[PDB]
Design a protein around this ligand. Structure first.
Ligand code: BCL
Ligand code: BCL
Ligand code: BCL
Ligand code: BCL
Ligand code: BCL
Ligand SMILES: CC[C@H]1c2cc3[nH]c4c(c3C)C(=O)[C@H](C(=O)OC)c4c3nc(cc4[nH]c(cc(n2)[C@@H]1C)c(C(C)=O)c4C)[C@@H](C)[C@@H]3CCC(=O)OC/C=C(\C)CCC[C@H](C)CCC[C@H](C)CCCC(C)C
Ligand SMILES: CCCCCC/C=C/CCCCCCCCCC(=O)O[C@H](COC(=O)CCCCCCCCCCCCCCC)COP(=O)(O)OC[C@@H](O)CO
Ligand SMILES: CCCCCC/C=C\CCCCCCCCCC(=O)O[C@H](COC(=O)CCCCCCCCCCCCCCC)COP(=O)(O)OC[C@@H](O)CO
Ligand SMILES: CCCCCCCCCCCCCCCC(=O)OC[C@H](COP(=O)(O)OCCN)OC(=O)CCCCCCCCCCCCCCC
Ligand code: HEC
Ligand SMILES: CCCCCCCCO[C@@H]1[C@@H](O)[C@H](O)[C@@H](CO)O[C@H]1O
Ligand SMILES: CCCCCCCCO[C@@H]1[C@@H](O)[C@H](O)[C@@H](CO)O[C@H]1O
Ligand SMILES: [Ca+2]
Ligand SMILES: [Mn+2]
Lengths: 32, 107, 10, 39, 286, 47, 50, 306, 39, 38, 39, 50, 39, 39, 50, 39, 50, 39, 38, 38
């Protein structure tokens, strides 16, 4: 295992979580 | 068969540098099993741990099968697929299953 | 008369 | 009014009859008690 | 207030030209029009090219090169793991690679076309987010994990009943797959999604054609559970749960072959923590 | 013989055909109901 | 409507439904005759009850 | 003639408790509603409570007995403790020792009673207000699979050990063992139908939620008043899905799709599980006879070995 | 008013007949009782 | 009216029935009495 | 108004009797003490 | 509206569907003739009932 | 008022004929009774 | 008016012809009866 | 509009649809000729019925 | 009014030609019949 | 608009679509000539029908 | 005004103290350094 | 009127670029040339 | 004015950047230059 490519791909898998987090944050901010 | 290497059994096997105090079944290998389980060596092989399609058998026997099968795959450093095609467990299409039958008879 | 739900209420 | 409608009776009876017929055919023909459609 | 509108006026009212992504990048959309009921734009052509080529490559690899007309007995399989990350036109697994690339192009084009159609109607971007979750699931199954592991032969085969053999063998290689924490979270979210869908469908159907007010369903859902969520809250919960179910199960399948080899040996730390190790007797030790 | 057993048709193929045909027909009828003329708010005044 | 139908079946049939019904019953009669013939021929070939 | 205030603020057995409602702020900000309570506590609701807590008490006390009445071992081992049905040597008998199957029998009987009484609660509280009874029949469809798992499949097989144990890990073990015992469950056609409907339910839930939130600027989530006259939000949702797929739905029949897709899952699963042991004792061999298994003569097994 | 439409009767009967005919032809074909479509 | 008769009746009856069933189950599983023994 | 309803008591007692009959039959006939329906 | 349709079938057709109906029935007749010829040739080649 | 339209009849009959033709060709090919497309 | 439009007929006929051509070419190439594309 | 169409087919065709129809039918006839020639050549090469 | 537009016809024909060219080039390359682009 | 389109094709074409159509048909003829030459060269190299 | 309330700080402090006391007691009991509760 | 110069420029440029990338990738993958070879 | 100079500048700049990144990645991960490991 290269451990450098694997961590880049893990970073991509984690970045895939971002739009849902942004949706929750937008809902929270826009409803005071 | 000769494809496995032709290795022999000597004193360093079963001992690994110790005269007495040998410990089969140490606490390290009992991670997910009850700490009193032992290999069922009073049965007959092949046929002692077969469960597929049997209507005189239920989940108790399947659990007793699974304990032994996890022991076998922990003592090899491998997964369930060293010896099976996981789409049909009765299948004998891997040679390690025959080797395992011979090694169950030996033990 | 004709309603989104398939009803025809006066 | 009447307790039940004619249409409901027809639907229930027809479906029950069809399902019972198929079930009885499956149970009887798959028992091996009768020599039917055999090579 | 309200009157009968034949739905031709509602469709013709909302058709506008040029508010898409390509219209903002190039200043114009080359294919900005409608064919039948469908909106063709850019990314509506790329997607259709990918769809046609993927279907053709799949059927050629199945019917030919395997000689079977039985659709449920094909094995559209990748190259072996001894080939590495190399592609060779003269070796088995070439029509699997072509089909995989075409399908990727089709799915990404579908996502971008959804973004375009959202932009035309002045909506939010929830549908592209929800679809991009499962598109990323496909990408991690067929691109990221094979690259990290080190071969194209780590992807699953595209046969109808035979991709279930890959699932079975991969799940029993990393035994026990039930003991994967992200697997459990994903299963929990799938079951919760089905329960919530049934609850919402029942709730809306139970009040449809009745001379009642819009506050009866709140009293119904407060008499039974002590708590009623609301009208936008239930649809938000639906969206969030649906997306998260697959977002969490990406991690389990990625970490199965790269950082972990055994999901029974993962839980070996639990009994060794100082708070409760060394407190039992025989067969209750550890 | 190249043919499946009768259970193959009973449990596998008839349900698949039923599912596909039911999906097609349900889609046809739901789209027929959705795109008809009923009470709507006028798009010109509402927007 | 309700013109060519007989007096007995007026509360059940239309002018067009009556014609379609006649077509359907003729189809069923023809199919029944053919089915009887086919069953007799296949029994002569190979009886399936033994 | 239904008085909602009386329905929510009545006293006695046929009435509510937690009468002064609470309020949670983060639920108000995220979900849009934060009031908690009051909750109805009438008949059919005390019976469920009492029988459920009887079964739960039995299970937890047996956990404690197994551990040895040691709280620290109890906390350490809580997620792999269970009570199991009587083993295969017993058949469907009830003369089983308490630490070998009697506790499971008692707890399961009480659980059956509680779920039936909860169905009755849903039905009667739906009729008491002005709404129809659609949640009760969905729960009935869900309970069909529950009673197949816990009562009828063991009855047809002939032993109690065909049923799951009561534990966090025991359900996973039951799933694994039941798939292993009867061939391979991937080649069960009604398991394929169940998975079809489950994944369709998740897809449809995500689609409906996303498209209602995306059009919520024009109050499209008020689906009660949108079934009398449809405004800009519903029109935009219809146009979106028509320009994407070529066909769309209403603000009425989409929830029909939801109900039936969620309902078919449990029915297909119950049929498949019941057939699993009693008619087809091996699903891979059956699939071979039914021509749905691929040949695979030369596997590349270097993928499946470390 | 009549309990059932003519259209419903036609649809139900035609669909049931077609399904039954296909099922019986495929059940008889794979039994091996008759020398039909045999290599 | 603080205490309601209907609640007391329902609770007492249900508690008695549950206790009777539990005691029968425990005594049957104990094996001390012959009862339904083979 | 009415402290007790006849209909509710009828429903509850009937259901309890049916459940008890089913349970007692199961427990008695699955124990092997009586020679009932022996092959 | 329906001038070419015979009086018997007026409640079921208008003259823009009578023509398409005639086309369809002619197609079906031609197909049936070809099918009979094909079946006779195939039986003369190898009988499928033995 | 006629029960069925001409368009629906045409669509249903045409689709049924095409599907039956494809299915019968597939079955007769896979049977192995006729020479046809043998290597 | 009339049952079908001209454009729907054109679309259906062209799509069906293209699909059938591709299917028949694939089946005949896979059968192996002809010496068509061989190394 | 509906003036180049023959009187029989007026309720079904336009002028533009009539022209496009003529093009399509001529295409079909040419393709059928080519298909017949191709089939004769392929049979002369290797017959597919034995 | 004409059935089809000229733009739609150009787009559809161009798409079909490109797809067929790519498909035929990829099939012929890997068929192995021609000594073209061989390592 | 259509003042240099021939009288026969007036209902179908425009003034600019006529010129674009001419360009497209010339492209197709040139491509067909090139394709015929390429096929003849490839057959002379290695025949694919044996 | 105030950043924190008295109620919140009291709740947090009491919870933290109880949890820490239990944790330290458990660690010291399982360490085995002291005799304490021995058999 | 339905044909504009800018849209055709966009389409032709995109098609040419994609074709060039595809042909480069296929020729590199074939292995027939000693190009970027270890 | 059909073409805006700003749009062409932006499009060409982005295309050049993307092509530079792609060519770097393709050349570096090959048998030759071997990620500069040598
Ligand atoms: C299903 C495919 C086609 C279609 C295929 C045909 C074909 C083919 C024919 C017709 C014919 C007719 N069709 Mg049509 N027809 C269709 C749709 C329609 C619709 C509609 C609005 O949908 C209507 C109202 C009709 C109605 C009609 C009549 C105008 C016409 C004469 C009726 C008839 O045959 O009497 C008698 C009714 C019968 C059912 C005859 C009985 C024969 C049946 C088939 C039994 C078969 C067994 C054996 C061969 C014969 C045994 C004889 C029996 C003992 C009586 N068709 C669809 C679109 N139709 C016929 C025609 O125009 O010739 C004058 C004709 O040949
Ligand atoms: C890919 C399709 C292209 C297109 C490519 C061509 C080509 C190429 C030609 C035309 C031609 C025409 N096209 Mg154009 N055309 C297109 C779209 C359109 C549209 C539209 C609104 O979409 C319209 C109204 C037209 C209109 C027209 C007419 C102006 C013109 C005359 C047809 C004709 O010659 O009749 C007769 C119609 C026939 C179909 C006869 C053809 C015979 C068939 C095709 C036989 C197959 C050929 C075979 C090799 C020959 C041997 C077979 C047998 C041995 C005989 N085209 C699309 C964009 N078009 C023709 C032209 O301009 O003439 C100078 C012409 O050559
Ligand atoms: C003989 C061998 C088997 C046996 C095998 C079967 C099979 C197989 C069947 C029965 C059915 C019956 N058997 Mg038995 N049965 C046996 C022994 C018994 C014993 C016993 C104590 O031994 C009893 C009480 C019964 C009792 C029964 C009844 C429940 C039922 C007949 C009455 C009825 O409702 O059908 C009368 C039927 C009707 C009233 C329906 C009318 C049918 C209509 C006309 C449809 C006809 C189909 C036609 C082709 C459609 C053409 C339509 C076109 C448009 C032309 N069976 C033995 C063990 N039995 C049948 C059943 O239907 O179960 C409900 C059934 O199929
Ligand atoms: C090794 C594992 C095996 C496997 C072995 C089995 C077995 C065995 C079964 C399934 C079943 C299912 N499998 Mg499987 N399955 C496999 C792999 C998969 C994969 C995959 C991607 O690999 C998928 C998607 C699935 C999917 C599924 C589901 C479709 C289905 C169960 C859904 C359901 O309705 O449960 C929801 C559960 C219920 C509706 C019943 C329980 C809920 C009730 C209502 C509880 C309410 C009362 C409760 C006590 C309330 C008290 C709580 C209080 C609030 C405190 N399986 C492989 C092949 N699978 C089940 C099935 O039915 O299919 C035939 C089943 O029995
Ligand atoms: C034994 C194996 C034989 C062989 C024997 C046969 C036989 C026998 C036949 C063919 C036929 C064909 N074969 Mg051959 N064939 C062989 C090998 C090949 C190879 C190859 C590289 O090996 C290829 C490229 C082909 C190619 C062809 C095509 C030229 C032709 C099928 C045309 C078609 O699909 O019509 C289907 C397409 C349509 C129905 C639609 C397309 C027509 C219109 C004009 C499309 C343009 C309209 C445009 C899209 C706009 C539409 C308007 C609206 C907007 C929709 N053959 C070998 C050696 N082949 C057939 C033929 O002759 O046809 C003429 C035929 O009969
Ligand atoms: C995120 C939670 C869930 C979810 C939601 C989700 N899916 C979605 C959407 C959303 C919000 C859409 O808006 C979208 C949609 O409906 O658009 C029309 C869609 C969609 N999700 C779909 C399917 C789908 N989603 C699934 C699951 C899920 N989707 C989740 C569990 C699954 C599975 C296996 O669980 C599948 C099958 C489609 C109905 C649609 C996407 C349509 C699309 O992408 O079109 C492009 C391509 C085609 C229409 C044809 C492709 C042909 C191929 C190129 C050839 C074959 C190659 C292929 C790789 C072979 C595969 C064979 C298999 C047997 C392995
Ligand atoms: C084991 C597998 C079994 C599979 C079986 C699948 C079942 C298929 C049957 C589908 C239902 C067909 C319905 C036909 C009749 C509907 C008529 C209609 O149009 O119904 C409308 C609504 O239907 C609508 O949403 C359309 C119908 C409801 C919406 C869809 C409901 C089904 C949801 C999923 C269930 C299965 C479908 C998918 C299966 C994979 C309402 O209109 P009305 O105001 O009443 O009209 C009055 C008059 O104009 C004459 O009707
Ligand atoms: C997994 C398997 C592969 C995927 C297959 C995907 C294909 C199809 C799936 C289902 C598609 C149909 C969806 C609903 C049907 C469309 C509805 C409709 O009817 O829409 C039509 C639009 O289709 C039109 O033009 C025509 C639109 C184009 C249709 C053809 C697209 C084919 C795509 C390629 C398929 C693969 C080919 C591979 C070759 C081997 C036009 O209708 P109108 O008469 O104008 O309507 C009347 C008015 O109310 C609106 O105008
Ligand atoms: C690599 C790609 C990384 C993308 C990170 C985006 C972070 C910001 C997102 C956001 O949240 O952007 C905020 C905007 C708008 O906000 P709103 O609609 O909530 O406003 C509401 C106004 N009423 O939503 C979006 O753009 C949606 C974009 C959807 C993209 C989902 C798929 C992309 C990620 C998954 C990868 C799938 C394959 C991609 C190609 C390989
Ligand atoms: C595995 C089958 C073994 C092989 C191979 C050898 N020995 Fe062993 N031996 C084995 C066990 C399980 C034990 C008992 C362990 C214990 O704790 O008592 C032994 C014991 C011995 C002893 C006695 C040790 C003692 O009494 O302290 C001796 C002297 C001994 N074994 C010698 C020995 C030699 C020389 C071997 C090679 C020829 C050999 N053993 C192999 C298991 C196994
Ligand atoms: C967008 C990602 C495209 C695929 C990325 C992989 C680059 C291919 O590059 C691969 C290397 O990754 C590999 O180490 C050796 C042999 O395994 O052969 C090279 O061609
Ligand atoms: C309502 C539930 C149906 C009751 C079914 C009863 C099945 C009885 O079956 C019993 C077995 O369970 C028992 O083990 C042996 C003992 O010899 O005798 C049988 O009769
Ligand atoms: Ca252990
Ligand atoms: Mn909703």
């Amino acid at each position: 295992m290269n451990w450098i490519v694997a961590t880049f791909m893990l970073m991509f898998v984690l970045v895939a979580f971002l739009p849902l987090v942004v949706s929750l944050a937008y809902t929270w901010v826009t409803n005071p | 068969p000769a494809s496995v290497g032709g290795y022999q059994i000597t004193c360093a096997t079963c001992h690994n540098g110790k005269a007495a105090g040998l410990e089969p079944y140490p606490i390290e290998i009992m991670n997910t099993l009850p700490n009193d389980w032992r290999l069922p060596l009073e049965l007959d092989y092949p046929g002692g741990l077969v469960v597929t399609g049997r209507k005189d058998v239920s989940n108790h026997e399947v659990e007793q099968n699974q304990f032994a099968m996890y022991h076998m795959n922990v003592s090899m450093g491998q997964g369930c697929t060293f010896c099976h095609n996981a789409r049909y467990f009765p299948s004998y299409e891997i040679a390690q299953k025959n080797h395992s039958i011979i090694m169950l008879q030996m033990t | 008369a004709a309603a989104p739900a398939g009803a025809a209420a006066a | 009014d009447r307790p039940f409608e004619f249409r409901t009776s027809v639907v229930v009876s027809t479906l029950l009859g069809l399902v019972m017929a198929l079930l009885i055919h499956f149970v009887v023909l798959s028992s091996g008690a009768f020599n039917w459609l055999r090579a | 207030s309200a009157e009968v509108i034949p739905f031709s006026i509602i469709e013709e009212f909302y058709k506008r030209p040029g508010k898409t992504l390509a219209a903002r990048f190039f200043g114009v959309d080359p294919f900005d029009f409608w064919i039948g009921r469908f909106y063709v734009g850019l990314f509506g052509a790329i997607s259709i090219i990918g769809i046609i080529l993927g279907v053709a490559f799949y059927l050629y690899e199945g019917v030919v090169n395997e000689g079977t007309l039985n659709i449920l007995a094909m094995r559209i399989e990748p190259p072996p793991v001894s080939q590495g990350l190399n592609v060779d036109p003269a070796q088995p697994g070439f029509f699997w690679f072509l089909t995989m690339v075409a399908a990727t192009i089709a799915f990404v084009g579908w996502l971008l076309r959804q973004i375009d159609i959202s932009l035309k109607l002045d909506m939010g971007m929830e549908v592209p987010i929800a679809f991009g979750a499962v598109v990323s699931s496909w990408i991690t199954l067929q691109w990221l994990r094979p690259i990290a592991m080190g071969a194209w032969g780590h992807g699953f085969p595209l046969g109808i009943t035979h991709h279930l053999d890959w699932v079975s063998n991969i799940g029993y290689q990393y035994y026990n797959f039930f003991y994967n924490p992200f697997h459990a979270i994903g299963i929990t979210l799938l079951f919760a999604s089905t329960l919530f869908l049934h609850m919402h469908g029942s709730a809306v159907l139970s009040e449809a054609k009745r001379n009642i007010s819009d506050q009866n369903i709140h009293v119904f859902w407060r008499n039974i559970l002590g708590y009623s969520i609301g009208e936008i809250g239930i649809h938000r919960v639906a969206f969030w749960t649906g997306a998260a179910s697959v977002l969490f199960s990406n991690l389990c399948i990625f970490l199965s072959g790269t950082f972990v080899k055994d999901w029974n040996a993962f839980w070996g730390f639990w009994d060794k923590m100082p708070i409760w190790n060394g407190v039992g007797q025989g067969a209750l030790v550890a | 013989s190249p043919w499946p057993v009768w259970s193959g048709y009973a449990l596998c193929f008839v349900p698949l055909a039923a599912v596909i045909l039911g999906f097609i027909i349900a889609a046809r009828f739901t789209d027929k109901q959705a795109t008809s003329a009923y009470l709507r708010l006028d798009p010109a005044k509402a927007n | 409507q309700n013109d060519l139908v007989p007096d007995q079946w007026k509360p059940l049939f239309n002018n067009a439904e009556w014609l379609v019904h006649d077509i359907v019953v003729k189809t069923i009669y023809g199919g029944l005759i053919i089915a009887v013939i086919a069953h007799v021929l296949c029994w002569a070939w190979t009886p399936w009850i033994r | 003639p239904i008085d909602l205030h009386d329905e929510e603020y009545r006293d006695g057995l046929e009435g509510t408790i937690a009468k002064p409602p609470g309020h949670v702020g983060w639920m108000q900000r995220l979900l849009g509603e934060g009031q908690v309570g009051p909750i109805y506590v009438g008949l059919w609701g005390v019976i469920s409570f009492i029988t459920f807590f009887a079964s739960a008490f039995i299970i937890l006390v047996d956990y404690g007995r197994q551990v040895g009445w040691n709280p620290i071992i109890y906390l350490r081992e809580f997620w792999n403790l269970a009570v199991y049905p009587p083993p295969t040597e017993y058949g469907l008998s009830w003369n089983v020792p308490w630490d070998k199957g009697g506790a499971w029998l008692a707890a399961t009987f009480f659980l059956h009673i509680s779920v039936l009484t909860w169905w009755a609660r849903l039905y009667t509280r739906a009729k008491a207000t002005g709404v129809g009874t659609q949640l009760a029949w969905g729960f009935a469809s869900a309970l069909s699979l529950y009673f197949v798992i816990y009562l009828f499949h063991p009855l047809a097989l002939g032993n109690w050990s065909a049923a799951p144990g009561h534990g966090f890990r025991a359900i996973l073990d039951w799933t694994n063992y039941v798939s292993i015992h009867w061939g391979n469950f991937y080649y069960n056609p009604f398991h394929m139908l169940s998975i079809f409907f489950l994944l369709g339910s998740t897809l449809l839930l995500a689609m409906h939620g996303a498209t209602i939130v995306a059009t919520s600027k024009w109050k499209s989530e008020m689906e009660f008043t949108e079934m009398m006259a449809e405004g800009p939000g519903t029109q935009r949702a219809q146009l979106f899905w028509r320009w994407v797929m070529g066909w769309n739905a209403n603000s009425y029949n989409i929830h029909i799709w939801a109900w039936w897709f969620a309902a078919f899952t449990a029915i297909t699963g119950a049929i498949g599980l019941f057939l699993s042991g009693t008619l087809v004792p091996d699903w891979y061999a059956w699939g071979e006879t039914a021509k749905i298994v691929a040949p695979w003569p030369n596997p590349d097994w270097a993928q499946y070995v470390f």
